[PDB]
Design a protein that fits this description.
The chain is built from 1 helix and 29 strands. With about 400 residues, it is mostly beta strands. It has a domain at about 290-375: Sandwich (Immunoglobulin-like). The longest helix has 7 residues, at about 240-245. The structure holds 2-acetamido-2-deoxy-beta-D-glucopyranose. 2-acetamido-2-deoxy-beta-D-glucopyranose (NAG) binds next to strand 3. 2-acetamido-2-deoxy-beta-D-glucopyranose binds near residues 134 and 143. It is a single-pass type I membrane protein.
Length: about 400
């Protein structure tokens, strides 16, 4: 039997329903998503880190000419400064006053700490939603991880569960993101091969172990001081450091819909966004006839207490006269009231207690119970505290009138 019902995509809050037919007893169904995960399809564009400016030892020729011998290292600068007269701890290096030459060259390379202190620049394409759910059908219970795509089923005990596509496809990650120190940032980093100096991406590598290294650090050499041996260089300050100094708070403190953000895998969890269109294919063999189950006759309902509140502040007693003692389900076919409990136990004729949370100030709802239903009605009072530390349990509704 094919049944389908939208389930609000809230983490920690439960959801209940009853599936029934003209000659088959109510079969309860309960769902509880303990963690809804939003993994995006992601690939690595590069990794960046602090640079370090390596530099070959100056090659000094005493009154002889030199040449800018080229090598091919990242962001290389090579220059042949003439008219030098260097000094060491032992005195003047050369005897010719003029015509001495010093060839000096400098280059960029990855910091020694880049293997463990680096930022990963990624592109995030599309979303994949998977949720850890607790599903019960007529006391057949399962705890699973369902891939929310409408395709992948979870088929334990013969009932086939399919969690349709997340109704409002949405991600907190833009197309192009960055990971650093276990925090995910939305940042339009330069494409590989366009990194500009003094900003994020000044040095880049396709992988942490990649041989290639593009560097654009605005490296330019200056002539050394007379009587000193060294390689002067003025360079744009490390763009990665500047990004660290100047960056907005991570998505874990700015993401919409209250999403939590985690980094392995890159993902967002507990996004209170949209709803999951669950579809349940219940086998014909799991249904039970109305005759077998406890049948209720001549029930009455009364709200012995009502506190219009986020939690289950509403209490109602049902006086029952059952045909045979046992257990059976209880529900409200309406968004007015959401029940804490799924089923109750009955002993011939007596009373039972139902907990619920409500939106209506003047509540009235049909409590469906054990192959019957009773019209519960009453007046309800406001709650105590202005602010509470948990999310809503009761479906909001327009009617809150006198
Ligand atoms: C779901 O099942 C798991 C089983 O480990 C349990 O720990 C968790 O509390 C259950 N959640 C609810 C309230 O259904």
């Amino acid at each position: 039997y094919e049944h389908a019902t939208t389930m609000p995509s809230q983490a920690g809050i439960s959801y209940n329903t009853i599936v029934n037919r003209a000659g088959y007893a109510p079969l309860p169904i309960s769902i509880t998503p303990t963690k809804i995960k939003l993994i995006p399809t992601v690939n690595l564009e590069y990794v960046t880190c602090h640079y370090k400016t390596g530099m070959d030892s100056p090659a000094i020729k005493c009154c002889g000419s030199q040449e800018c011998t080229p090598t091919y290292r990242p962001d290389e600068q090579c220059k042949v400064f003439t008219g030098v007269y260097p000094f060491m701890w032992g005195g003047a290096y050369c005897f010719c006053d003029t015509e001495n030459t010093q060839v000096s060259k400098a280059y960029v390379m990855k910091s020694d700490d880049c293997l463990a202190d680096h930022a990963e620049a990624y592109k995030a394409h599309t979303a994949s939603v998977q949720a850890f759910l607790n599903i019960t059908v007529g006391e057949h219970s399962i705890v699973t991880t369902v891939y929310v795509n409408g395709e992948t089923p979870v088929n334990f005990n013969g009932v086939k569960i399919t969690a349709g596509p997340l109704s409002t496809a949405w991600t907190p990650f833009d197309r192009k993101i960055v990971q650093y120190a276990g925090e995910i940032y939305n940042y339009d980093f330069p494409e590989y091969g366009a990194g500009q100096p003094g900003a994020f991406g000044d040095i880049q590598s396709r992988t942490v172990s990649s041989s290639d290294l593009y560097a654009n650090t605005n490296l330019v050499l200056q002539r050394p001081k007379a009587g000193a041996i060294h390689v002067p260089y003025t360079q744009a300050p490390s763009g990665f450091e500047q990004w660290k100094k100047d960056k907005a708070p991570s998505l874990k403190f700015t993401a919409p819909f209250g999403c939590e953000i985690y980094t392995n895998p890159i993902r967002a969890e507990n996004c209170a966004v949209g709803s999951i269109p669950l579809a349940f294919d219940i086998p014909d063999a799991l249904f039970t006839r109305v005759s077998e189950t406890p049948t209720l006759s001549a029930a009455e309902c009364t709200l012995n207490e009502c506190v219009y509140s986020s939690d289950f502040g509403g209490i109602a007693t049902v006086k029952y006269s059952a045909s045979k003692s046992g257990k059976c389900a209880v529900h409200v076919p309406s968004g007015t009231a959401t029940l804490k409990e799924a089923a109750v136990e009955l002993t011939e004729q007596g009373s039972a207690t139902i907990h619920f949370s409500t939106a209506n100030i003047h509540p009235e709802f049909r409590l469906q119970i054990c192959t019957s239903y009773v019209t519960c009605k009453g007046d309800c009072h406001p709650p105590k505290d202005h602010i509470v530390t948990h999310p809503q349990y009761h479906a909001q509704t327009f009617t809150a009138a006198v």
